Amino acid sequence: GLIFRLLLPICLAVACAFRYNGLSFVYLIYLLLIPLFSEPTKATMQGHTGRLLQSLCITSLSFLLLHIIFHIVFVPDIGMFIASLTIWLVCRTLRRFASVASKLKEFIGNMITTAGKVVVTILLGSSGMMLPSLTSAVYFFVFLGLCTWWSWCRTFDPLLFGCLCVLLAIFTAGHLIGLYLYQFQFFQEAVPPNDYYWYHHANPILLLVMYYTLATLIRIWLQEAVFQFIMKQSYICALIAMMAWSITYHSWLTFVLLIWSCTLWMIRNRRKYAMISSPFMVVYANLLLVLQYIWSFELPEIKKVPGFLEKKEPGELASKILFTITFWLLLRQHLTEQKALREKEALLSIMKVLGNLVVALFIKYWIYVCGGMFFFVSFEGKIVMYKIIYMVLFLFCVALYQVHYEWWRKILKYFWMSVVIYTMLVLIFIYTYQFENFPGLWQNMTGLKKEKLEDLGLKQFTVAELFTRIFIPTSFLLVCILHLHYFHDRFLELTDLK
């Protein structure tokens, strides 16, 4: 019944974790071999495997003794004793955890058998981002490829999935062999893949549990009401993550993502064009992700590009994964909806008063919100030139409204257009002033002293304050375009002299 075997994995692991010779290597081999066979039953295969393991271990102890006796630290003995005890227990076929462990095994095995694919992908991603190298690049790339394939509608038949599991299993087997076999080799650098013996001493256990889940899976394979607003928020958060990416890993590449998000904010029907441009965003995201992972290796002889992609830590990649999953979900939704529309067209071939009241209230009382946003934009932090130009525009608008009011009714939308244009220019200028040539290019082109130039807001920020310096004007632009698109013309036709 509750006749377990994982105890043998446990003791084989603790036995191979501290002794390193040709004697423990076979113990590690058999440890790797355990998760392939079933639990002990009325069977001959697992029985003979166990019995041969015990024979080999006892004989190895005997060989150690017959070596040490010739005269013309031996925890392996206790391991052999435990192995023989388990052999006898199998031949036979206060206390709180007895059934607890059984329940744990049962529910975890059922968790594997239901949706093992996604947990394998999660393990692949974790192993990839754990310790970057050329070897872990295999795991990371197959992770990324599987996630991209799932993002598309194209599915996968289980036999190819199983052969991929077999390939990855033998690959991680060889990887663990190299890892726990390296304690003899004599090298320190000129080779990326591994190192010698959580920062980097927690990877082998992750690879081991990965291989164990893969082994259970392959063993299984050989037993022959408001969710619309939620979709809206989904594409919105995908866009905002696309924007926020270009702040963490500042480079002349992700500037295209930032400018794309900016130019996508200011469009009439943004959902349609966002869904259209979704796949390109996904492919570009994962491409620059591969570039990130490559240039985040262990070795400093890569000669990072000065203005473009540069050198980063391994930890600063999970945030990029969190960004890319938004693109993946966006593409999934877009493709599903497009397929539904296509099959539909193939098949063919009490609260209103609240809405009216609130839309009228916004038509009449939103220009004041846009005006009040000027103060929040211009009166935060230090005082610089562009924050003064903002107030200059605001005061000019108010003065022109007070003076004539006939021109002010004709030159209103042009004001908002100029405002959003100026905000875009401010974004571009404050973003580009973070490279290396620019802080000197401004002087060499237009000679101004360092602080005299910095007084215009241009300075070297940190990864925190730049979020503010980008989003505050971004929020202002968003509010302004929201006013311009929906409420402007209705407001202008509301208050007029007929």
Ligand SMILES: *[C@@H]1O[C@H](CO)[C@@H](O)[C@H](O)[C@H]1NC(C)=O
């Ligand atoms: C400023 O930088 C440029 C970069 O090409 C270089 O010619 C020189 O260092 C300076 N040029 C000036 C001062 O015009």
